[PDB]
């Protein structure tokens, strides 16, 4: 049960962690690509593809980041604090009708 | 040995702005097929891992 209540929250929180990490993955794929541009292009090609690099990051990534997270875009499910009290005990006792 | 024209083509593509979000990690395509997964209203896409 506690794993089901855990994955009620943590499957949502690492979904938005994954959501912004997919953004870092395309941010990184921006950088590893252009690192290969600099080592390979002609000096004329660098200016033509740097301006296209400017316009690429201003049109794939120019808008505000839509991964908004403070406490409220989350539903009310992520405000609970589970507790679990009780006591198990083994007894050699009769049944006391 | 061979000059390569390489049969240049008629690639017709659709640049679809696919908005995925809060994806659940899922295995290969055979179980992420709509009629057998049935996502909640929070999660909105399925990440095919393998």
């Amino acid at each position: 049960q506690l794993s089901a209540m855990k994955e009620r929250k943590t499957n949502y929180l690492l979904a938005v962690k994954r959501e912004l990490l997919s953004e870092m993955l395309v941010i990184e794929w921006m950088e590893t690509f252009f690192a290969h541009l600099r080592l390979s292009l002609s000096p004329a090609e660098f200016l033509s593809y740097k301006h296209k690099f400017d316009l690429a990051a201003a049109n794939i990534f120019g808008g505000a980041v839509r991964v908004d997270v403070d406490l409220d875009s989350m539903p009310a499910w992520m405000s609970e604090k589970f507790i679990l009290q009780g006591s198990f005990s083994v007894t050699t006792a009769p049944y006391a009708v | 040995s061979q000059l390569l024209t390489g049969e240049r083509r008629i690639f017709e593509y659709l640049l679809c702005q696919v908005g995925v979000g809060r994806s659940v990690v899922v295995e290969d395509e055979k179980e992420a097929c709509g009629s057998r997964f049935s996502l909640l209203w929070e999660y909105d896409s399925a990440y095919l891992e393998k």
């Binding site: 690492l14 962690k17 994954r18 990490l21 997919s22 870092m24 993955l25 990184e28 794929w29 950088e31 590893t32 690192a35 600099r38 080592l39 | 990690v25 990440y47 891992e49």
Partner: peptide
Amino acid sequence: TTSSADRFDRLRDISLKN
């Protein structure tokens, strides 16, 4: 090479089964 690298390959696997 040229920065990135070691942080690219660690978050390539975005499935956080860790």
